Design a protein around this ligand. Structure first.
Ligand code: HEM
Length: 309
């Protein structure tokens, strides 16, 4: 069949919790490291972990290594079922809340600068909480290395190597399937971030890693073609210029702008090829740009939705 003739929403259901590589993780502590910001940090107690980022990666990796029970708080992005009853430490979306963090008495914060403010991260460290700044590569090729880096922080190198190899095998296997399913002329795609019916409506660019996702799905990322490094408002002119065949979105994001019907009311959407086919691939918010352990499964399920009727 011809995937350019497909119409309407395709939605991938939540992939769920990461399958841990072990049932008896025993962190080898203490660890000393120099983090991505150049801070020397000693990690001596991982009993109460806050694994915080924009993308939902770290919480999933920590669970994959065998430490899900050690997670005591989360951001809005870590939507995995195991953490559904865990205290949320961000507000207004992605803003760190120092009070919420400190009241959980964490023993380890794993974080990066995808969320802020930086001042809150500094406050937590000054209060005595071991805080480790990561700077993950966030590419499909580097899924294993990003996992090994997290594993080192919590003193689980063997679990890290197992989880890395398992995840990389899964994502290469999925790629084999994607390559068989892709059309000769790749679909043009963009990653459209929406939250609400107002101005939070953006084409995501290089910094957010969606090119890696779109190319992993066999598509061409029009944001990369147009040189969008951070993000761009998805206004009528930008949409007309990018003219994707498919909008890749987050499922709850799409709901928040009124579903397909609400999306079609936004200026410029209906005029694109994707708009004229109402063609949206909706991915679970907390996995969509998390990469990490579940990347292979995400690519497999999403490619089935894109290319199989
Ligand atoms: C790129 C990775 C991102 C992920 C995985 C992500 C994920 C999420 C999730 C899961 C929520 C909670 C929605 C809900 O509870 O239904 C949320 C909320 C929110 N996000 Fe993001 N987000 C991302 C990036 C962004 C960006 C780039 C912006 C702005 C430029 C943004 C602005 C917001 C705002 C304002 C909210 C508040 C929604 C509310 O009040 O319910 N997010 N995000």
């Amino acid at each position: 069949t011809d995937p350019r003739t497909f119409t309407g929403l395709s939605i991938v259901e939540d992939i769920g919790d990461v399958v841990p590589v072990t049932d008896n993780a025993s962190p080898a502590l203490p660890v000393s490291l120099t983090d991505a910001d150049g801070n020397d940090v000693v990690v001596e107690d991982v009993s109460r972990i806050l694994p915080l980022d924009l993308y939902g990666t770290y919480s999933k990796t920590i669970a994959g290594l065998g430490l899900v029970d050690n997670i005591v708080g989360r951001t809005v992005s870590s939507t995995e079922p195991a953490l559904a009853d865990t205290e949320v430490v961000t507000t207004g979306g992605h803003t760190l809340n120092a009070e919420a963090i400190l009241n959980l008495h964490p023993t380890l914060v794993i974080i990066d600068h995808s969320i802020g403010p930086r001042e809150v991260i500094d406050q937590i460290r000054a209060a005595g909480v071991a805080t480790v700044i990561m700077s993950p590569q966030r590419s499909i090729a580097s899924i294993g290395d990003d996992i090994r880096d997290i594993a080192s922080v919590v003193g689980l190198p063997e679990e890290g190597e197992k989880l890395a190899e398992r995840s990389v095998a899964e994502v290469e296997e999925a790629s084999t399937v994607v390559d068989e399913l892709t059309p000769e002329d790749p679909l043009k795609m963009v990653f459209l971030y929406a939250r609400g019916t107002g101005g939070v409506f953006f084409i995501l660019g290089d910094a957010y890693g969606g090119r890696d996702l779109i190319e992993g799905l066999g598509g061409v990322d029009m944001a990369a073609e147009k040189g969008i490094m951070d993000l761009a408002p998805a206004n009528a002119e930008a949409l007309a210029e990018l003219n994707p065949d498919v909008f890749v979105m987050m499922s709850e994001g799409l709901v928040s702008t009124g579903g397909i019907d609400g999306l079609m009311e936004r200026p410029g959407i209906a005029q694109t090829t994707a708009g004229q086919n109402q063609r949206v691939l909706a991915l679970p918010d907390g996995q969509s740009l998390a990469f990490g352990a579940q990347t292979g499964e995400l690519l497999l399920r999403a490619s089935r939705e894109l290319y199989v009727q």
